[PDB]
């Protein structure tokens, strides 16, 4: 809604949106991640990670590398403009960030970093 979106990460390796919209007149933007289903974080955990489209794969491949105890993101990966933490079924985690970190004329991509998840769980974030 007002300066934030609710997104669902389920048991079928999905996000219920591939296009996140951000009103320019938002000083900050909040994302509230939610996980319906009964699979554990260690079997079907998701996160919400944001970067440019050029950096997405680096962030994914490195996040792949770091492991489960790093939530499948690289420590202080400066390619990450913001990210929620890894959540299992029934859990929730929200993230908030400076809307000014999204520079005009750039391509931004949200995605889930566990192994193979981004292939279905990825999308565009737009600073309309």
Nearest CB to Cu ion, comparing residues 46 and 83: 46
The residues of the shown chain that bind Cu ion, judged by CB under 5 A, are 46, 112, 114, 117, 121
- Give least dist CB 96 to Cu ion, A: 20
Nearest CB to Cu ion, comparing residues 112 and 127: 112
Q: Residues 49, 109: contact at Cβ < 8 Å?
A: no
- Give least dist CB 34 to Cu ion, A: 13
Neighbours of 26 (CB within 10 A): 16
- Give least dist CB 103 to Cu ion, A: 27
The burial class, CB within 10 Å (0-12 / 13-18 / 19+), for 116 is exposed
Pull the structure tokens for residue 18. 């591939």
């Amino acid at each position: 809604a007002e300066c934030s979106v609710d997104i669902q990460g389920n048991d079928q390796m999905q996000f219920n949106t591939n296009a996140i919209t951000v009103d320019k007149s938002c000083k900050q933007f909040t994302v509230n991640l939610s996980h319906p289903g009964n699979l554990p974080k260690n079997v079907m955990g998701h996160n919400w990670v944001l970067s440019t489209a050029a950096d997405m794969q680096g962030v994914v491949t490195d996040g792949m590398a770091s492991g489960l105890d790093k939530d499948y993101l690289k420590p202080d990966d400066s390619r990450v403009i913001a990210h929620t933490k890894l959540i299992g079924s029934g859990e929730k985690d929200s993230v908030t960030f400076d809307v000014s970190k999204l520079k005009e004329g750039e391509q931004y991509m949200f995605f889930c970093t566990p192994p193979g998840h981004s292939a279905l769980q990825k999308g565009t974030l737009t600073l309309k």
